[PDB]
Structure 1
Amino acid sequence: GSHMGKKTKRTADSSSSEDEEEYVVEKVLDRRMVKGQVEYLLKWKGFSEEHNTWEPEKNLDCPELISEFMKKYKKMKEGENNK
């Protein structure tokens, strides 16, 4: 077994330019479901809760944010302890 006949195929776009267009999320704020669809309040770079922006689960690309959020929220609401 020896290396013979190698192949290479890569694709990339050549767009050398920078401009404000995309927005980055900071963390989850609140959660609410409407029209059989669950949405989460996400904060975009520069944007504040004042704008009250909601994002669908499908678009939600940050599960960890919810995992931890539930931890804090749980304490807020009065429930029961279980192990």
Structure 2
Amino acid sequence: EYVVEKILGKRFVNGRPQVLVKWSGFPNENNTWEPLENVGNCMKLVSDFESEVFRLHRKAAAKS
């Protein structure tokens, strides 16, 4: 288990959610996709990411 700096993306693989993890102390080159089941101990960063997605969805809505 490693310290997480930020959550950068979200996707589904075979219908199951994953998130893109920037690891603290590692460069972005080593970012990895992880099952949402793996990130229970960084939900503040996951919430930050979710908040940003919603903000962008609201923008896409506005422009439509």
TM-score interval, smaller chain? 0.5 to 0.7
Pair 1:79 & 2:61 matched: yes
1:43-82 to 2 correspondences below 5 Å: 43-61=22-40, 62-77=42-57, 78-79=60-61
C-alpha deviations, 1:14-58, integer Å up to 9, x for none? xxxxxxxx5211121111111122111112232232223011111
Instruction: Find the structure with the greater CA-based Rg.
Output: 1
The alignment covers a number of residue pairs equal to 59
Work out the CA distance in 1 between the residues paired with 2:4 and 2:19. Answer: 12
User: Identity rate of aligned residues, in percent?
Assistant: 44
Greater share of strand residues, 1 or 2?
Answer: 2
- Segments of structure 2 that go 5 or more residues without pairing to the other structure are none
TM-score with structure 1 setting the length: 0.56
Runs of 4+ in 1 over 6 A off after TM superposition: none
Greater share of helix residues, 1 or 2?
Answer: 2
- Structure scoring higher RCO (CA < 8 A, sep ≥ 6) equals 2
TM-score with structure 2 setting the length: 0.67
